[PDB]
C-alpha cells in the first residue's frame, strides 16, 4: 500500500528541515548583529546572549525532532523502492516514476537531494552529539567570545549539505568546510594555555590529509570531466590510476580518522581542548572521514590487495590498545580508546562494498555515544575536583556516588555486555575477520579486548575507589540533573538502538 | 607499627631489617636501641611460634625464652665494635629469617592490617556542609558580610547559565507610577 | 627527598573565565603530584639512538617490527584463502557503485 | 563497627532505617508481581515442551519436523 504520498513526504521533510535550520540561523545572526554595536556580551540580566542561547538550543532540539520523523520516512521509502524493482518480473513494464519539485523553496546549490542510510546515520549523530556538546559549553562562553554559540548550527548545516548531495565536488567542499570552526573553537574557547599549539598541530595534520584527498579529487575530476557519482559507472580507471587514487584517499582520510602513524595531533588536541569540543571531535567529526572514504571507495573499481591497509589499521588498533596501561590522565586514556575503536571501524571499509560495511556503520554510532559519555564523565570529574589525573583524585565513590556509579556502568558498556550495540558491532566485524583471517582475528581480539581493556579498567577503577582524605574543605557535590539525564540518555540510546530495524545493518 | 612488609616493592634485606628492627636503616640506632629492638622481635617471633602455634609446648617455650634472655643480657653489656656482638646479631637475624612466615598474623590495630581503613570517617567540614538550607538554616542574604569587604552573593553550587530573561506574571501592571504621579502634580 | 622547588604548573589563557562549580573552592596542589602530572609530556630523549636500548633491546625491536609481522601473517593467510577460494583481501566491486540503501529516482 | 556520624547533605546509605518500610515494601512488591505476571503471560505463548508420557509423535503429522524442497 505504498504510494506517492510517502515519497513526497520524505523528500519535502528532507529539504524543509534544512531550510528551517537555515532560517533559524539567519534570524538569530541578524538579531545578534543588529542589536548592539560591538556584538559582545553586556554582562547584565537583559543580554541578548540569553536569547541567543535558548534559540540555538531550541533549534537543534526541534530540528532533531523533525529529523527523527524525516528519518523514519526515508526508511520506509527506501524499503519500498527496492521492492518496486524486485517484483517487476514482467518484461514489458519497468518502474518509470518521475517526480516534481516543490514550489516554495529553491534547491540549495542547484542540486537534487539524494540520501542514503549511512548519511542519515551521520546526520543523526551530528544532531545528538552537537546537542550534548553545546550543553557542555555553557561555562566556557562569556564576555567577548559568545559568538561561538553559533558553531554547532553551522556544523549541522554543513553536514546536512554534505550528506544530501550526489555532487562529488560539493561533497569535497563540504568536507573541507569543517576545519575553520573547529580551529576557532579550540583557539578562542579553550582555557588551557597549551591549547594554542595544539590547535596548530590539529590544523597542520588535518590539512595534510585534506591535501592528499584534494590531489585524489583533482585526479578524478580532471580525468573524468564530471561531478556526478553516476557518470563514474561509464568510465574505467587503469591499474595505476586506481592504485594512486586508493592510496591517496586512504592516507588522506586516515589523517583525520586517525590511523596508526598519525594520531599525535588527536592526542594533543584532546588533552588541551575544551570538554564540549572534545565530545564533538571524538563523537562526530572523525566520522566525517569514514563517510567520504566509503563513497570514493565504492564509486571506483580497484584491483589491488587490501592487505597493506588492513595491516595499517590493525597496527593502529594494537598500538593504541597497548598504550592504555601507562596513562594517568583520564582524557588521554579516553583519546586512546577513541583511536583504537576508530581504527577498528576503519578496518571494516577495507573490503569494498561487501557486507563488512554494516558493522562499521553501526560501530560508528556506537563509538559516537561511548566517546561522548566518556568525555562527559571526564568533564564532570575535572569540574568537580579541578583535576583529571589519577595521582591527584581517587575515591570518586563514597563522595558524590552517582559519578562513580556512572563510571562503573560506562566501564561495563565499554567492555561490551551482550545486551548493547557494542557487542553487536564486535560480533559483525569479528565474524567477518575470523572468516577472512583467523589468526589475525584472534590476535586483534586478544590485544584489544584483554590488554587494552585491562589498562583502561585499572586506570578507571583506581580513580573510583579509595578514600578521599586530602581536602575535605573543598570536596564537591554530586551530579546535577543535566549531567544525570545526559548519561542516562547515552545508556538508553545504546540499549534501545540494539532494537533497530534489521532491514538495514 | 605499620605492617607494609609486602605491599611495597621491598627487597628481602629491607624486609629483614624491618622485621628485626623497627626501621629500614638500623645504622642510625644506638647500641641499646638495637639490642632492645632485636630482643623484642625475637620474643615476638618465639611467642608467635611456640605459644600461638600448631602443637604448642609451654615447657619448651619457657626454656627457649630463658636461653634467649640470657644471651641478650650478655649482648647488652658488650661493646658495639666487638666481633662477638656482631656474631650475636647475625645469629638472631638468622633466627628471625628461619622462622619467617609468609602468612604472618597481623594485629588488626596496625596501620596496614587486613581490616584497616574499611570505613571513611567524615570530619566536621563535611558534617556542617549544607548549601541549600534544609538541615541548617540558610539566610536569604546567603552570607554575613564582614567589615572591610563589599557585599557579594555566594557562588552557587550549580553555575548552569542556561537561563531565560526574567519571568513576570501575565498582565503585570508595570507603569511608571511615580513619574505619572509627579507629572500630574506639576 | 625534598619537595620540588621548580616544576611545570597549570597555565590558563589570558582573560580566561574561571570554572565556578560547587561554590568555586580550589585547594592548594601538591608539588610532587603536579610534577608527575607534567613530567611525561615534557620528557625527551638525550642522545641519538638512545631509544633502541632503552628498556629491553629485544622487546623494543620486536615492537618496532610489528607492522611487518602483521603484513606477513596477512600475506600467508591470503595464500591460504587463494587456494581454498575464500574471501580475498580485495576491494570488492559487486554493486557497480550503487550505494547501500540509496534513493535512485528521476525528476520530470 | 562503632557508629559514627554521617553528613546530612550526603545521599549515602550508611545505617539507614526507614520507619515507613512496611507500606513501601507492599507498594514495591505487589506491582512487581503484577508486572512479572504480565511478562510470564506474554512468554508462555512462545514456550515449547516435549510430548507427555504415553504419547508419540506421528512422523507424517504437520507438527513433525520437516525438510526443505529445493
Amino acid at each position: 500500500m505504498f504510494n506517492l504520498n510517502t515519497i513526497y513526504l520524505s523528500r519535502i521533510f528532507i529539504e524543509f528541515n534544512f531550510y528551517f535550520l537555515f532560517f533559524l540561523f539567519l534570524i538569530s545572526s541578524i538579531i545578534f548583529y543588529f542589536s548592539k554595536i560591538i556584538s559582545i556580551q553586556n554582562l547584565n540580566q537583559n543580554s541578548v546572549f540569553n536569547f541567543l542561547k535558548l534559540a540555538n538550543i531550541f533549534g537543534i532540539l526541534i530540528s532533531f525532532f523533525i529529523h527523527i520523523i524525516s528519518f523514519w520516512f526515508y526508511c520506509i521509502y527506501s524499503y519500498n523502492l527496492s521492492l518496486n524493482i524486485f517484483s517487476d518480473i514482467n518484461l514489458y513494464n519497468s518502474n518509470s516514476i518521475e517526480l516534481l519539485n516543490n514550489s516554495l523553496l529553491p534547491n540549495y546549490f542547484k542540486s537534487n537531494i539524494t540520501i542514503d542510510f549511512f548519511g542519515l546515520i551521520l546526520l543523526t549523530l551530528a544532531y545528538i552529539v552537537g546537542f550534548v556538546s553545546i550543553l557542555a559549553l555553557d561555562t566556557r562562553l562569556y564576555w567577548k567570545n559568545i559568538k561561538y554559540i553559533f558553531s554547532f548550527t553551522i556544523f549541522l548545516l554543513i553536514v546536512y549539505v554534505y550528506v544530501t548531495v550526489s555532487n562529488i565536488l560539493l561533497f569535497f567542499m563540504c568536507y573541507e568546510l569543517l576545519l575553520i570552526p573547529s580551529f576557532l573553537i579550540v583557539y578562542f574557547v579553550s582555557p588551557s594555555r597549551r591549547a594554542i599549539q595544539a590547535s596548530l598541530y590539529f590544523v597542520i595534520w588535518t590539512q595534510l590529509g585534506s591535501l592528499l584527498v584534494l590531489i585524489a579529487i583533482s585526479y578524478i575530476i580532471s580525468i573524468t570531466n564530471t561531478y556526478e557519482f553516476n557518470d563514474l559507472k561509464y568510465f574505467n580507471f587503469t591499474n595505476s590510476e586506481s592504485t594512486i587514487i586508493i592510496f591517496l584517499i586512504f592516507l588522506g582520510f586516515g589523517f583525520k580518522a586517525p590511523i596508526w602513524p598519525f594520531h599525535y595531533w588527536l592526542t594533543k588536541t584532546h588533552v588541551e581542548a575544551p570538554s564540549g569540543f572534545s565530545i564533538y571531535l571524538s563523537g562526530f567529526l572523525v566520522k566525517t572521514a569514514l563517510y567520504g572514504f566509503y563513497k570514493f571507495n565504492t564509486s571506483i573499481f580497484i584491483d589491488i590487495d587490501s592487505s597493506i591497509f588492513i595491516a595499517i589499521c590493525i597496527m593502529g588498533v594494537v598500538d593504541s590498545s597497548l598504550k592504555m596501561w601507562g596513562q594517568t590522565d583520564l582524557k588521554k586514556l579516553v583519546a586512546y580508546g577513541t583511536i583504537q575503536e576508530m581504527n577498528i571501524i576503519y578496518l571494516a571499509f577495507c573490503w569494498g562494498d561487501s557486507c563488512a560495511i554494516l558493522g562499521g556503520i553501526l560501530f560508528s554510532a556506537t563509538h559516537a555515544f561511548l566517546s561522548a559519555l566518556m568525555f562527559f564523565l571526564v568533564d564532570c570529574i575535572y569540574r568537580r575536583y579541578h583535576t583529571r589525573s589519577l595521582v591527584e583524585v581517587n575515591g570518586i565513590l563514597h563522595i558524590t556516588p552517582n559519578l562513580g556509579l556512572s563510571i562503573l556502568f560506562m566501564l561495563v558498556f565499554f567492555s561490551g555486555i551482550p545486551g548493547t550495540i557494542k557487542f553487536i558491532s564486535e560480533f559483525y566485524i569479528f565474524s567477518g575477520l575470523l572468516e577472512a583471517s583467523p589468526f589475525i582475528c584472534f590476535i586483534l581480539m586478544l590485544v584489544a579486548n584483554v590488554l587494552g581493556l585491562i589498562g583502561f579498567s585499572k586506570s578507571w577503577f583506581n580513580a573510583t575507589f579509595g578514600m578521599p582524605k586530602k581536602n575535605t574543605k573543598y570536596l564537591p557535590m554530586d551530579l546535577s540533573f543535566k549531567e544525570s539525564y545526559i548519561i542516562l540518555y547515552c545508556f538508553f540510546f545504546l540499549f534501545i538502538f540494539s532494537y533497530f530495524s534489521s532491514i538495514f545493518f | 607499627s605499620k605492617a607494609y612488609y609486602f605491599v611495597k616493592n621491598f627487597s628481602w634485606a629491607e624486609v629483614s631489617n624491618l622485621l628485626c628492627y623497627g626501621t629500614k636503616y638500623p645504622t642510625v640506632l644506638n647500641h641499646q636501641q638495637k639490642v632492645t629492638r632485636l630482643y623484642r622481635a625475637t620474643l615476638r617471633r618465639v611467642y608467635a611460634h611456640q605459644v600461638e602455634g600448631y602443637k604448642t609446648d609451654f615447657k619448651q617455650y619457657n626454656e627457649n625464652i630463658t636461653d634467649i634472655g640470657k644471651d641478650f643480657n650478655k649482648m647488652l653489656a658488650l661493646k658495639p665494635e666487638s666481633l662477638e656482638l656482631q656474631a650475636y646479631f647475625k645469629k638472631y637475624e638468622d633466627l628471625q629469617e628461619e622462622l619467617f612466615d609468609p602468612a604472618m598474623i597481623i594485629d588488626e590495630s596496625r596501620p596496614y592490617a587486613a581490616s584497616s581503613g574499611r570505613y571513611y570517617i567524615f570530619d566536621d567540614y563535611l558534617l556542617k556542609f549544607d548549601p541549600f538550607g534544609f538541615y541548617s538554616p540558610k539566610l536569604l542574604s546567603e552570607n554575613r558580610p564582614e567589615e572591610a569587604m563589599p557585599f557579594y552573593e555566594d557562588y552557587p553550587q550549580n553555575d548552569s547559565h542556561w537561563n531565560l530573561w526574567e519571568q513576570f506574571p501575565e498582565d503585570f501592571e508595570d507603569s511608571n507610577a511615580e513619574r505619572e504621579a509627579i507629572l500630574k502634580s506639576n | 627527598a625534598a619537595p620540588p622547588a621548580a616544576f611545570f604548573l597549570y597555565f590558563f589563557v589570558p582573560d580566561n573565565f574561571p570554572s565556578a562549580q560547587s561554590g568555586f573552592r580550589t585547594a592548594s596542589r601538591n608539588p610532587f603530584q603536579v610534577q608527575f602530572v607534567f613530567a611525561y609530556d615534557n620528557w625527551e630523549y638525550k642522545y641519538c639512538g638512545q631509544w633502541w636500548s632503552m628498556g629491553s633491546l629485544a622487546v623494543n625491536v620486536l615492537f618496532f617490527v610489528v607492522p611487518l609481522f602483521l603484513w606477513l601473517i596477512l600475506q600467508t593467510q591470503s595464500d591460504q584463502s587463494s587456494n581454498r577460494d575464500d574471501n580475498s583481501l580485495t576491494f570488492y566491486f559487486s554493486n557497480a557503485g550503487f550505494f547501500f540503501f540509496q534513493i535512485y529516482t528521476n525528476t520530470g | 563497627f562503632q557508629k559514627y556520624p554521617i553528613p546530612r547533605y550526603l545521599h549515602v546509605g550508611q545505617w539507614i532505617v526507614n520507619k515507613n518500610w512496611k507500606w513501601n515494601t507492599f507498594h514495591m512488591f505487589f506491582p512487581t508481581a503484577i508486572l512479572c505476571f504480565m511478562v510470564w503471560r506474554n512468554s508462555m505463548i512462545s514456550t515449547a515442551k516435549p510430548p507427555n508420557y504415553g504419547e508419540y509423535v506421528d512422523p507424517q503429522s504437520p507438527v513433525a519436523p520437516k525438510a526443505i524442497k529445493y
Binding site: 596501561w325 601507562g326 596513562q327 594517568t328 595521582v391 578514600m467 582524605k469 586530602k470 | 596501620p111 581503613g117 570505613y119 571513611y120 570517617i121 570530619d123 | 627527598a1 620540588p4 601538591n30 610532587f32 603530584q33 610534577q35 608527575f36 613530567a39 611525561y40 620528557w43 | 562503632q2 559514627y4 556520624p5
Partner: peptide, 26 residues
Amino acid sequence: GWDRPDVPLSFNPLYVHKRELSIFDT
C-alpha cells in the same frame, strides 16, 4: 562501661608523598 568518644579521624591517616612519582612507574 565507658563513654567512648567518636571514631577518630586518625583511622584514615593522610599520606604525605615524601618521594617523587616516577613516570617509569606509571
